[PDB]
């Protein structure tokens, strides 16, 4: 099963593709994790994305393309895959077309715009593994700890509110094109194409989102 999560900053993508991962045992490709890893341990590829990042800005089409590509020609995904970020324009998704990747399920999660601000600054993240949490919404069962090995939560650098602003406008004007983009691929038989409503509790959105994948 080959699945691409679609939504706003702040929609829960994240959040439902821990649970997406251990039913159906696929691996999750992030791309957000892949170039925060990188900025963390100084690789040469995605290290220098930090301050691109710390301005709320979508860093270049390339330099994702390659980090995608060499993590999906690894070997958890022959039996198929989660991509949740990417693809993040219309060039990064022609990009996968040309390729010949085709996928079966594309899941949307709306939200409304004035959501977003208080669930950003609230999370709470687990680096090594990409869990997220929310202070208020969603929190540990230990109070700044990581639920599964139980080591310390942080908050992201890029998380105030400003920078999610900045982010929610750079959505409006280059990612949610692909709402369109895919829901002209499923008409042609090359998807399915189901949307969520992401303000039901974490829960009900995980049932909702079974009832859809079987
Ligand atoms: N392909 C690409 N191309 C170019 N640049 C790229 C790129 N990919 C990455 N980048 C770069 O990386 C930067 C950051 O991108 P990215 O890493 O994708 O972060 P983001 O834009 O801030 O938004 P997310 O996708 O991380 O949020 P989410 O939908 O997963 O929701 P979550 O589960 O966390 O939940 C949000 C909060 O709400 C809580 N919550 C979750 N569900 C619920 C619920 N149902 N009810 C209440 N609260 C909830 C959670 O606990 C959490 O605290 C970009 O700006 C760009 O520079
Ligand atoms: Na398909």
């Known amino acids: 099963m080959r699945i691409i999560l679609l939504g706003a900053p702040g929609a829960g993508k994240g959040t439902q593709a821990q649970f997406i991962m251990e039913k159906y045992g696929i691996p999750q490709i992030s791309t957000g994790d892949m170039l925060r890893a990188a900025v963390k341990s100084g690789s040469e590829l995605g290290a220098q994305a930090k301050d691109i990042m710390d301005a709320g800005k979508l860093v270049t089409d390339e330099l994702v393309i390659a980090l995608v590509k060499e993590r999906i020609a690894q070997e958890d995904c022959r039996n198929g895959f989660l991509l949740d970020g990417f693809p993040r324009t219309i060039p990064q998704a022609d990009a996968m077309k040309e390729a010949?990747?085709?996928?079966?399920?594309?899941?949307?999660?709306?939200?409304?715009?004035?959501?977003?601000?208080?669930?950003?600054?609230?999370?709470?993240?687990?680096?090594?593994?990409?869990?997220?949490?929310?202070?208020?919404?969603?929190?540990?069962?230990?109070?700044?700890?990581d639920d599964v090995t139980g080591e310390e939560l942080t908050t992201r650098?890029?998380?105030?509110?400003?920078?999610?602003?900045?982010?929610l406008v750079e959505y409006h004007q280059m990612t949610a094109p692909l709402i369109g983009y895919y829901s002209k691929e499923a008409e042609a038989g090359n998807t399915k194409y189901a949307k969520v409503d992401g303000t039901k509790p974490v829960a009900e959105v995980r049932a909702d989102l079974e009832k859809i994948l079987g």
């Not at 715009?113 to 208020?136: F, T, W």
């Open 100 to 145: 010949g990747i085709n996928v079966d399920y594309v899941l949307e999660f709306d939200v409304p715009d004035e959501l977003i601000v208080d669930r950003i600054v609230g999370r709470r993240v687990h680096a090594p593994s990409g869990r997220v949490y929310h202070v208020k919404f969603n929190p540990p069962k230990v109070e700044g700890k």
């Open 157 to 167: 650098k890029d998380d105030q509110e400003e920078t999610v602003r900045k982010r």
